[PDB]
Amino acid sequence: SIDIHSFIATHPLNLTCLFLGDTNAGKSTLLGHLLYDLNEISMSSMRELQKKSSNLDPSSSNSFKVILDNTKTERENGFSMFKKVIQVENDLLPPSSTLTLIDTPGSIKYFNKETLNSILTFDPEVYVLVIDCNYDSWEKSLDGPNNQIYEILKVISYLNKNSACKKHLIILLNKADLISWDKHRLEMIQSELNYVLKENFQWTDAEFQFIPCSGLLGSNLNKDSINYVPEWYEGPTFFSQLYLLVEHNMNKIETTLEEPFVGTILQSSVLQPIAEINYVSLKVLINSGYIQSGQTIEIHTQYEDFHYYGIVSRMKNSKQILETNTKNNISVGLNPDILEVLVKIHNTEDFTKKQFHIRKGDIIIHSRKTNTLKLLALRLIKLSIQTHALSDPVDLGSELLLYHNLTHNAVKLVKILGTNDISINPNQSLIVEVEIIEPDFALNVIDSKYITNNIVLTSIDHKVIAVGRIACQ
Ligand SMILES: Nc1nc2c(ncn2[C@@H]2O[C@H](COP(=O)(O)OP(=O)(O)OP(=O)(O)O)[C@@H](O)[C@H]2O)c(=O)[nH]1
Ligand SMILES: [Mg+2]
Ligand code: NA
């Protein structure tokens, strides 16, 4: 009836680029300007955005960043608070491809809320580290070994050890206009980062590159001296490098048919009013495999016990910052599509007394109705971690935060396997056990060769201690 095989063959190959950096770096601005350069923002829509920007703080706002800072609360505050996911598909990209651009907040409060988890949730092929090269800003942004830029590097430099894939880091030396493309300054900043990346974080030349730019003026983003690229610069533009990365990503082995279906619930809303049969609208990021309408699924909550059996009523494209068609129904969802998935669930019990609570970070899988997918609910969690630079050792009984997929939970360090050591130390590779502190909470873990289960351990103050993976066995 339906050719599952054919749908996968006509599915464009996606590349995901994740933008990272401190607040005020210019991530939202640059990324808004990029979208404009790719003709994803109409002239009419643009003029409306300048008007909005006129009514806001002229110290914080411009017409490009308001494209990404599109919530009422972010516009009044003047900085990003929520991660944005934009999928681009047009004739400026390689054929049969999509470019996913992800914005993340830099302000430390919302960085700790969303950004670290975005790295683990969306599993980007490319990191884009945006840096403010304006005078005094750069010097202020590297205070000690735990500055916010190094905290980013303490994660992305060490994820997915043993490779099978290689890292791709683009460092955007931004706001070059505010320094009139000071050659010796840009070279200095580049020299400094190059050393740290190589000596402290073990990056190799092929894995990264520097690109000077101005996200506001659009200098060197794509294709009498302002909005100019100086004569001495002979490197590539930002988008040219993005293009190549998407293109080289084309030659990637696609194992979708083999993969089991796994999806992460990014957002959930129960249609009102509630009834004997209820309909839940889920925003789902597909982690692996595929899902088609009419199939039976299982929703597993972070609330330790709850599990819901339901049927996929319909699926739609998720609402995006760019204009898309959310009216039409989709037959098939594929890794890494983000879809609206309407789930039909029949209440076993009285529907008024007991109402289900489906939260972000919960997973959805195909129903194991009565090769079956192994699913674990863990309170005591074994972790295969590796440390590097550590200011202070981490003793047993320490309280930590465990980042996994879209969730972060307080845990207690309860055991260090294979040794009588009483603490985690610098530059080690350990097997460790942590315990969920929160009552009636359990971490959902899928044991499969097609799921990474990367994690990050931080202190309560959100200082990265180690990177690792859930050890299921
Ligand atoms: N002169 C100049 N200013 C820029 C440039 N890019 C961004 N800005 C300004 O820098 C400020 C911060 O820009 P944002 O786009 O909000 O940077 P951000 O990294 O997204 O900030 P967060 O969302 O808080 O992480 C804004 O007031 C912009 O007008 C640039 O290329 N040149
Ligand atoms: Mg922003
Ligand atoms: Na900002």
From Swiss-Prot:
Annotated region (G5), positions in chain: 214-216
Keyword rRNA-binding among UniProt keywords: no
Location of region: G1: 21-28
Location of the tr-type G domain: 12-237
Complex and partners: Interacts with the exosome and with the SKI complex composed of at least SKI2, SKI3 and SKI8. Interacts directly with SKI3 and SKI8.
Its job: Represses the expression of non-poly(A) mRNAs like L-A or M viruses and is therefore involved in antiviral system. Mediates interactions via its N-terminus between the exosome and the SKI complex which operate in the 3'-to-5' mRNA-decay pathway. By interacting with NAM7, is also required for nonsense-mediated 3'-to-5' mRNA-decay (NMD). May recognize a stalled 80S ribosome at the 3'-end of a nonstop mRNA which leads to the recruitment of the exosome and SKI complexes to the mRNAs to be degraded.
Remarks, miscellaneous: Present with 233 molecules/cell in log phase SD medium.
Protein name, per record: Superkiller protein 7
Gene this chain is encoded by: SKI7
Part of the full-length chain shown: 254 to 747 of 747
